[PDB]
Design an enzyme around this catalytic site. Structure first.
Site, PDB file in Angstrom:
ATOM      1  N   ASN A 228       0.254  -1.458  -0.206  1.00 39.83           N
ATOM      2  CA  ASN A 228       0.219   0.028   0.308  1.00 39.83           C
ATOM      3  C   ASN A 228       1.082   1.579   0.229  1.00 39.83           C
ATOM      4  OD1 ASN A 228      -2.213  -1.681   2.529  1.00 39.83           O
ATOM      5  ND2 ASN A 228      -2.232  -1.377  -0.023  1.00 39.83           N
ATOM      6  N   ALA A 229       0.867   2.299  -0.694  1.00 40.26           N
ATOM      7  CA  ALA A 229       1.169   3.169  -0.960  1.00 40.26           C
ATOM      8  C   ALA A 229       3.239   3.468  -1.389  1.00 40.26           C
ATOM      9  CB  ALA A 229       0.921   3.914   0.302  1.00 40.26           C
ATOM     10  N   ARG A 236      12.363  -6.848 -12.376  1.00 43.07           N
ATOM     11  CA  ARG A 236      13.626  -5.460 -12.749  1.00 43.07           C
ATOM     12  C   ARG A 236      13.891  -5.278 -12.018  1.00 43.07           C
ATOM     13  NH1 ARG A 236      13.391  -8.914 -18.010  1.00 43.07           N
ATOM     14  NH2 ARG A 236      12.268  -6.716 -18.860  1.00 43.07           N
ATOM     15  N   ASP A 262      -6.996  -6.919   6.309  1.00 41.46           N
ATOM     16  CA  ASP A 262      -8.755  -6.393   6.418  1.00 41.46           C
ATOM     17  C   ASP A 262      -9.712  -6.960   4.868  1.00 41.46           C
ATOM     18  OD1 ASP A 262      -7.753  -4.918   3.843  1.00 41.46           O
ATOM     19  OD2 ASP A 262      -8.542  -3.076   4.920  1.00 41.46           O
ATOM     20  N   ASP A 287      -4.538  -0.399  11.084  1.00 47.23           N
ATOM     21  CA  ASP A 287      -4.633   0.986  10.538  1.00 47.23           C
ATOM     22  C   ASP A 287      -6.243   1.588  10.435  1.00 47.23           C
ATOM     23  OD1 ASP A 287      -2.919   2.844   8.732  1.00 47.23           O
ATOM     24  OD2 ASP A 287      -4.181   2.539   7.037  1.00 47.23           O
TER      25      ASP A 287
HETATM   26 ZN   LIG Z   1      -0.623   4.832   5.692  1.00 55.11          ZN
END
Ligand SMILES: [Zn+2]
Ligand SMILES: [Zn+2]
Lengths: 398, 399
Positions: A228-229, A236, A262, A287
Site C-alpha cells: 500500500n502506497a 527488474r 482487512d 491501520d
Molecule cells: Zn499509510
C-alpha cells in the site's frame, strides 16, 4: 515475591511457536516457571482458574492505529488524553493489550499540541498500554501520499533532523516514524532517529530497492503497510517489497513489515507471498481510523474527511483508501483464513513480531517466563473471549 | 549388460546429496541389491569420481535454437540443426530438451514439425523429448519478441483451428498459449486429452482466468514474470497461480524461469522459489545467438541483435530470448537465491521431468530410471555428461 500466584488451568498456551497443553502461572503481573517456583519457593498457586480448554496467547500489539470509536488521534482537541483512553479501553475487546497511537501528516501546530499529551503508559483496567507514538508522515512522497494531504507534506533538505524536530516538537513520546527514504538527506535523519531509540519505517514512498536497502543500513527496521502506497513489485525493479528477499541487508537482522489484513488493502496472494517469502517479519496492523467500531458514516483522518462506503473507508469524494475499520482480531482471523497458515503463525504476527520490532520481546508478545502476563483467551476460531493485562482480567465477552 | 559402479561420489537422490555409489546397467540406474539375485555381485568397471557430485542430467523444455541454428526456420536440413544443438548442449549438462518454435506462419509448422520427432539421447546429442510450440495463440499485448503479423486466435473452430495451424501434433509435447483467448478452454482440454502439456504465457490473463485454465488441464507457466501481468496486491494475474488455493487438489503448477541474470532480478527468483519451490523449472529460452555472442541473428520471422550480452529484436529494446546456457542458469539461480545445491539441480532436471510425466525415467537417480547424469564440482560446474550410462562429454582429461 509478595504477590499472589495465579494458575490458569485446562488451557492450551502459545509458547515457543507451539500450542502446548500446559498451565499458565502468573505472579506480580509476570509469567512464572511453575517448576522453578515449587523448587525454589516451595509455593503453590494461591488461586486457580479453569480456562475450559480454550487457547491462551500473548495480547495483540497494534503499532499502526489512527483512532477509533469516533476518536481521531490527529486532532488537537480539548481532551486528547480522554480520546486515547477511550480507544485504549475499547480495543481490549479486540484482544489488543498494547498499541502505538498513530498520527498522520499534519501541520506542525497539531504535533506540538498532541504529541506531549500521549506519553507511554502501562496497560491495565483503564485500557491497552500506550507504547509510544507512531508518526506517519509528513516526510513522505507526494506521489504515494495516499490519504495524506499534499498541503502538509514536508522534506528534509534544508536542515534534516532539525527540520523534523521543529515539525514534530520534542520526540520523547515517539516510538515509530514512517518516512519515505528517497527524500534527500534521509540518511542523516534515520541515523538521528534510531540513535534516540526511535524505530524508522519506510512507507508512502517511490523508493527503489537500492534506496530501501540503503535506508535499512542507516537503521530502518520497518515497512509501513506493505504493497500500500508504494511502487509494485517488478521483476527488474522490485521496490520496497524486494526488502523481503534482499541478501544485501545486515546479516541476521530481521526487517519487519506491516500488512493490513482487512480484505481490502491486500488480496490473499499478497499476504501469502509475503508470509512465504519472509514469515518472521510480518506484522499485522489494523491501520484503523475513527470509524473503527462504528462501521459507517463520515469521519476525519487528520486534515482529511473520510467516508465509509459499505465496508471500505475512502477519502471523502474519492476512491483513495484511507485506513481500515477491521479490528485486530478480525485481521488475525482473515490472515489465518487467507494464507492457510497455522494458528500459531497468525497469533505471532499480531503480537510476537511487533514486540520484536520494538525490542520488547522479553516483556511483551510472548508467554515466556518473566514476560508480562498480557494475554487473550481464544476459542478455536480465534475469537477473543477474554483479555488479561498484568495477570488481571480487563475485558470479558458477554 | 555391463555393470558400471561410480564410487567416491555424492549422488542427488530423494532431495539429498548422499555419499553413496551409483550403479548402472543397460542404460538404466541399477539397484545394487538386485545383484544379490544374480551370478555376479561385483561391477565390471569401477569409476572413482574424486568426491564429485552426480546429478540427473539437465532437461531444457524451452530452447529456440542456438549456435547459429534457428528451429523456427524451414531450412533444407532441419534435423541437422537440431542435432548440432543437441550435440553442443551436452557440454552444458543438458541430456534432454524440447526444441521450441516461436510464432510462425502455418507453412513453417507444416514443414518443420514432422522433421523434429522424439529421439533418444546418446553420443550424437541430448535427447529430444518433443516440441514446445510457443505461440501463435498468444496475446498481442504481451507478444514480446513474437511478430504481431503471425498471431492467431481460436474463436472460429478452436482445436481444429489449432490443428490447421500446426499440422499433425504427434511430435508436439508442449504448447504455450494465452488463456484469455476465447474458446481456450476447449483447446486446452483437447490438447491435454492428447497428452500435450499446456503452458500459460504471453498473456494478460487475470488470476481467475489462469486458474480456470489450470482446471481445463494447463500445468505449466512459460517464463514466469516475462510477458505476463505483474504480481499485484489487487489481482496477481498468472503469477498468482504460485499462491492460489483454487487449483485441483494435489496438482503442482510448474513454472519456467530464465535465470540468465537479465530476464529477472534476484528478488524475482527468490520470491517465486520461496512461494512455490516444488514448481520451479529452469529453462534457458536460448536463441540462435547462443554461443555466437554480439551481432545480428534471427528468431523465427524476427531479426535479433545482441548488444552487450543482451538480445533484442533488431531496432528495438524488446527482449528476444537469452544467450545463457543451462549450466550458467543453474549456477546463477544457485547464487541469486542462496538455495541448496539440491534445489538448484532439481529445478533443472527433476521438476521439468515431473512436469512432463517422465519422473520414472528422467530427472532422477532412482532405480530403473535412465542413466542420464552429470558430474559436477561443488560450484556446479559440469565436468562430464552421461547418457544411458555412457560418457558423452568431458570438460578435459587432466585427471
Ligand atoms: Zn499509510
Ligand atoms: Zn516467450
Amino acid at each position: 515475591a509478595g504477590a499472589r500466584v495465579l494458575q490458569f488451568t485446562n488451557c492450551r498456551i502459545l509458547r515457543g511457536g507451539k500450542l502446548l497443553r500446559e498451565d499458565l502461572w502468573v505472579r506480580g503481573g509476570r509469567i512464572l516457571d511453575p517448576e522453578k517456583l515449587f523448587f525454589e519457593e516451595r509455593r503453590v498457586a494461591d488461586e486457580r482458574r479453569d480456562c475450559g480448554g480454550r487457547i491462551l496467547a500473548p495480547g495483540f500489539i497494534d503499532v499502526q492505529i489512527n483512532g477509533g470509536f469516533g476518536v481521531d488521534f490527529s486532532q488537537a482537541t480539548e481532551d486528547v488524553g480522554s480520546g486515547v483512553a477511550l480507544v485504549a479501553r475499547r480495543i481490549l475487546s479486540h484482544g489488543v493489550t498494547s498499541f502505538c497511537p498513530t498520527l498522520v501528516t499534519s501541520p506542525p501546530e497539531v504535533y506540538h499540541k498532541v504529541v506531549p499529551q500521549i506519553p507511554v503508559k502501562s496497560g491495565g483496567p483503564h485500557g491497552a498500554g500506550v507504547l509510544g507514538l507512531h508518526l506517519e508522515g509528513p516526510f513522505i512522497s507526494r506521489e504515494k501520499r495516499g490519504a495524506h494531504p499534499e498541503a502538509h507534506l514536508r522534506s528534509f533538505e534544508a536542515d534534516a533532523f532539525q527540520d523534523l524536530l521543529a515539525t514534530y516538537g520534542p520526540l520523547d513520546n515517539v516510538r515509530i516514524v514512517t518516512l519515505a527514504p528517497e527524500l534527500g538527506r534521509s540518511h542523516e535523519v534515520i541515523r538521528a532517529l534510531t540513535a534516540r531509540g526511535i524505530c524508522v519505517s519506510l512507507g508512502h514512498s517511490v523508493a527503489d530497492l537500492r534506496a530501501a536497502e540503503d535506508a535499512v543500513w542507516s537503521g530502518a527496521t520497518f515497512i509501513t503497510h506493505l504493497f500500500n502506497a508504494m511502487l509494485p513489485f517488478h521483476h527488474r525493479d522490485p521496490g520496497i517489497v524486494g526488502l523481503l528477499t534482499s541478501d544485501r541487508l545486515p546479516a541476521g537482522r530481521c526487517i519487519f513489515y506491516g500488512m493490513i489484513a482487512d480484505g481490502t488493502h491486500t488480496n490473499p496472494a499478497a499476504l501469502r507471498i509475503a508470509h512465504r517469502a519472509h514469515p518472521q517479519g510480518l506484522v499485522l496492523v489494523t491501520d484503523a481510523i475513527p470509524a473503527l467500531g462504528l462501521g459507517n458514516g463520515r469521519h476525519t483522518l487528520g486534515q482529511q474527511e473520510v467516508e465509509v462506503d459499505g465496508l471500505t473507508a475512502y477519502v471523502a469524494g474519492t476512491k483513495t483508501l484511507s485506513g481500515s475499520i477491521a479490528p485486530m482480531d478480525v485481521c488475525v482471523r482473515h490472515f489465518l483464513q487467507a494464507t492457510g497458515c497455522s494458528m500459531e503463525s497468525a497469533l505471532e504476527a499480531a503480537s510476537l513480531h511487533p514486540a520484536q520490532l520494538l525490542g520488547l520481546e522479553k516483556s511483551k508478545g510472548t508467554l515466556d517466563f518473566g514476560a508480562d502476563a498480557d494475554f487473550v483467551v481464544l476459542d478455536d476460531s480465534l475469537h477473543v473471549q477474554a483479555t488479561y493485562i498484568s495477570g488481571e482480567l480487563v475485558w470479558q465477552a458477554d
